[PDB]
Amino acid sequence: SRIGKLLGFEWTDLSSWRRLVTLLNRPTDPASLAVFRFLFGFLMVLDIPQERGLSSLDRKYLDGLDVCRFPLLDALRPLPLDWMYLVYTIMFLGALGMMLGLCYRISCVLFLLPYWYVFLLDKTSWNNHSYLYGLLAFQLTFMDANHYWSVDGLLNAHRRNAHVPLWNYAVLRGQIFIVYFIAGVAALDADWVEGYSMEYLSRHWLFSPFKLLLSEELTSLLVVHWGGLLLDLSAGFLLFFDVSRSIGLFFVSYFHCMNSQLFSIGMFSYVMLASSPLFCSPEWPRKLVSYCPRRLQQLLPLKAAPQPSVSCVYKQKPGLRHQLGAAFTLLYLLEQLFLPYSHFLTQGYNNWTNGLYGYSWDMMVHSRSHQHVKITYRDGRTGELGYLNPGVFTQSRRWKDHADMLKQYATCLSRLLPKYNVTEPQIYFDIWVSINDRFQQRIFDPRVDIVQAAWSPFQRTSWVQPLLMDLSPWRAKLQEIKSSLDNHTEVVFIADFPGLHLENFVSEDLGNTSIQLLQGEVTVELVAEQKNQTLREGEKMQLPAGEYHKVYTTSPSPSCYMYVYVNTTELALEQDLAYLQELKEKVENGSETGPLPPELQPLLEGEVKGGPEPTPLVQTFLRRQQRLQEIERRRNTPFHERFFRFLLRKLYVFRRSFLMTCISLRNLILGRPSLEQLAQEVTYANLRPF
């Protein structure tokens, strides 16, 4: 029938459970499943020393170090450094076995268990492509991916060129479609459609051909934003149908190739590229081998027809294995569709977006900008106030946007502080964030002690400041102001809630600073003079430099205002430097016949030898000139040199990871050697290549 030739099955196959099980276990060619299996394992091997964190294990998990960590479960803790190296060694071996097909099921488990343990250890390392790797490994554990091109085929005669169940391809194809489609739906947000996210991505040289027929603004809006949205929503349908597969393959290949150079996402683009041929005929690799010379065929996988396999149902009564496989493909695909939209039961992980980042397929939709962070503590006994350096005991900055991470950070601080003579501290946070070029605003209540604050996984957090969505239309006006400013002027846009105030200390270098009111009403107090002045819409007031001032939001609705300032110290210094350069040019061109000043002598000589120490202005000028020369030298570098340096950097990363693992494995098995011996070995492992 027409439907049978289009979808690959018929309505009769869904009539009963037995028919459904029979259809899902239909024998299929394993050539395509094997090629993807090899490619996935090869890329996993490459990724382990680069992004999984093998080359920085000693720095991250240093023994006897004070660090605040963010595990999903508070009871999950890492192992000592030597045992952490063993975990990565087992993960590496499992990936190698998967790529080769040697002891397929054991190798799959060896990769899977260590991978998820490391993933759950750090919530700050979660992203969409790392989440996908764990999903792909989980699926392949139950698949017969070692039936065509693997070592297991040589070890066992029954696993050499054998059929595989159809649900092996259905689950993999369904997973890839979900990644495309859910991403396209998430890209339906107003910010994406209007072109606010990644509004500067069209300046890359890779977009040169488009600019020959479009403007910069038009190219960004149509190509980058609407083009990406269209591909996500139609990539799955294009690949599935064979009348449009050729067009889809070219479009997705171009889409992924560009992304590999526009962003730094590790192996994401290469994994997606490899998954594309999974929609083609399951025997495409075998057909390609058929077009090879007879001599070359002796070094390639078999080309004959696959042999029957017990995993499939042949036109018999299905057994337990077939029924379980049918159940898995239905339940697993159902769970994948639901989870990205489950952010209504776990209400404790929503602050401004939905849930933790990593399992919603929302790539590059929201961009954040942080302006300032302040951490305050008050001693429980003494009662004195103090301030901490933001992110003092952290290895990442993601704690600023999540209430679950902030609660962990505050608990960690209260445990460490007593060792610095602080007893029973109370900690407050003041973080200013802006999302997609909006007004800068607070994200948490600055009057709440987070140590004693209440947090639950299933309850909405009480001390999270709502996002001011009503002020979004101001973005057009904000850009207009920022485009009319002078080359030496800067502006900051702030919105504050009623009943709150902002305390600001203006640096001495920021001469000529002023504040103007855009909406609402505020009161500005000069702390030193104890003077209060009220402001009205469109009113601007000058502020002193090197002093304190406070802004009170007295309106019943949030107020908006902007800061305009100029760095006077830098401006004067640059003018002096420019004047010196003009004088030097006058000397060089033959003018200024008069004797050069003693300070100008170092400029001509370029080396301070046998003379008085040069003034800071001369040193600054020399440093700037040297920096410009280095920049010019870096630009004038042939492509061959650039590629060679790139390969050398990779070689050092791979070599260091191997040597550090050997040292740790030696300690575990034989025993720790003398300190002098250990110091020498670490020095050897830190040597650069070549």
């Binding site: 730094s264 954040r368 300032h372 600001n504 800061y563």
Partner: peptide
């Protein structure tokens, strides 16, 4: 510098080192 002082803590108009916007999807060294 674990401990700060009043002037540095409240200095809002300071050169932000993390001026560039982040995506949360890009790998960081």
């Amino acid at each position: 510098t674990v401990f700060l002082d009043h002037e540095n803590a409240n200095k809002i108009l300071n050169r932000p080192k993390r001026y560039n916007s982040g995506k949360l999807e890009e790998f960081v060294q």
